[PDB]
Paper text:
However, the M10.5 counterpart of the MHC peptide-binding groove is open and unoccupied, revealing the first structure of an empty class I MHC molecule.
A soluble form of M10.5 was expressed together with human β2m in baculovirus-infected insect cells, and soluble M10.5–β2m complexes were purified from cell supernatants. M10.5 was crystallized in space group P212121 with five molecules in the asymmetric unit. Ordered N-linked carbohydrate is observed attached to Asn223 within the loop joining the third and fourth β-strand in the α3 domain. The carbohydrate occludes the counterpart of the region in class I MHC molecules that is the major determinant for binding the T cell co-receptor CD8, likely preventing M10.5 from participating in CD8+ T cell–mediated immunological responses. A superposition of the α1–α2 platforms of M10.5, H-2Dd, FcRn, and HFE illustrates the variation in groove size and demonstrates that M10.5 has an open groove more similar to the peptide-binding classical class I MHC molecules than the non–peptide-binding homologs. We conclude that the M10.5 groove does not contain a single defined peptidic or non-peptidic occupant or a mixture of compounds with a similar conformation. In class I MHC molecules, Tyr84 and Lys146 occlude the F pocket side of the groove, but the tyrosine to glutamate substitution at position 84 in M10.5 contributes to the more open M10.5 groove.
Residue numbers in the entry:
A (entry chain B): 1 to 99
B (entry chain A): 1 to 39, 43 to 143, 150 to 193, 198 to 274
Write the structure that this text describes.
């Protein structure tokens, strides 16, 4: 039984404009593990992006954390894009600054 | 109480010639090792760098072995259940020992799946099993093996781990908390950068346990080894202050209370 991923886009520390930081895309509760995850800045898929080692939860569903360093700006709009065996078209979640 | 768990995954994707194998180990919320067939056995926690190369040699040898075994098994089961050889197939296995704050064995666990088809699972009684599926339903010494590994080697493995990371493993990092006001109102209680992950966030309409009408998400990782969590509620424009959120966490002097500033 396949299970679509749950996506959360957020910052490590609170969004302080012009202040460095880390942007996280947390995907979890999905199965199988064949998942595609992107971090976008104003639309362009961001370069060097690390991600955690694959592990699973009690219900055997998988989870991963993708992230990069980044200095937000009032102008720049970021987001996470996910494609999975259970998604017809890639899901895109925009990073809300107050979430 | 603490847990040392090892995860093994065998993945088969539609097309991939050979199955992919990965193995990670955690000591509670912290991952400290990692082996990936799509490459040896590497460290994940900063404090692990204190182990002899003779160690990683040992470790990589084991993962190497386990991997041949796991792939063989996944293929076996995909067969028994007579499934389309080419396409998704997953074999997942978890085992680990629950050790108490005082180095004493509390319990252990072991479970294996051909996800969606078979489940073989060691019971809490650590003396019985739980077959499930064509294969494994037909599952059969083996028990004592685990009862041992878990009480013995595993715990020894745990203790040795705590020895090497107590500093970061037993820390208590308190939540940096605050509240936020959103208009449709919805008040959000935030807890950030806390460790351990066990935390408590609740709201109260006029000091009364206010359930239901709220939202209770799920702790997520900050990325640095600590966590984040939030809880919010919906309250009548202006009629706000009748709501307060209470934060409870191991690293705090005592309970903390917040209201819309
Ligand atoms: C108030 O809420 C807490 C939250 O867990 C609950 O345990 C408690 O039972 C409630 N009131 C009491 C003390 O019965």
């Amino acid at each position: 039984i396949q299970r679509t991923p749950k996506i959360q886009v957020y910052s490590r520390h609170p969004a302080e404009n012009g202040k460095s930081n880390f942007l996280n895309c947390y995907v979890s509760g999905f199965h199988p593990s064949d998942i595609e995850v992107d971090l976008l800045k104003n639309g362009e898929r961001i370069e060097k992006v690390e991600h955690s080692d694959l592990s699973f939860s009690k219900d055997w569903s998988f989870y991963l954390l993708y992230y990069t360093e980044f200095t937000p700006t009032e102008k720049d709009e970021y987001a996470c894009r996910v494609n999975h065996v259970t998604l017809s078209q890639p899901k895109i979640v925009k990073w809300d600054r107050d979430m | 109480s603490h847990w040392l768990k090892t995860f093994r995954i065998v993945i088969m994707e539609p097309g991939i010639l050979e199955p992919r194998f990965i193995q990670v180990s955690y000591v509670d919320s912290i991952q400290y090792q990692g082996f990936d067939s799509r490459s040896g056995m590497q460290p994940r926690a900063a404090w692990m760098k204190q182990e002899p190369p003779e160690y990683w040699k040992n470790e990589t040898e084991h993962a190497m072995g386990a991997s041949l075994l796991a792939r063989r098994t996944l293929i076996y089961m995909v067969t028994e259940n007579n499934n389309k050889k080419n396409d998704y197939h997953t074999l997942q296995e978890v085992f680990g020992c629950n050790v108490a704050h005082d180095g004493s064995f509390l319990g252990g666990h072991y479970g294996l799946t051909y996800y969606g088809y078979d489940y073989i699972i060691l019971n809490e009684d650590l003396n019985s099993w739980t077959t499930e599926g064509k294969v494994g339903g037909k599952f059969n010494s083996v028990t004592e093996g685990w009862r041992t590994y878990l009480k013995g080697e595993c715990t020894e493995r745990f203790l040795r781990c705590l020895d090497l990371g107590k500093e970061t493993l037993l820390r208590s990092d308190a939540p940096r908390t605050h509240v936020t006001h959103k208009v449709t109102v919805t008040l959000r209680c935030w807890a950030l950068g806390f460790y351990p992950a066990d935390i408590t966030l609740t709201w109260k309409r006029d000091g009364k346990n206010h359930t239901q009408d709220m939202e209770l998400p799920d702790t997520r990782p900050a990325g640095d080894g600590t966590f984040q969590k939030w809880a919010a509620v919906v309250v009548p424009f202006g009629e706000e202050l009748r709501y307060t959120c209470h934060v409870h966490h191991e690293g705090l002097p005592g309970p903390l209370t917040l209201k819309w500033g």
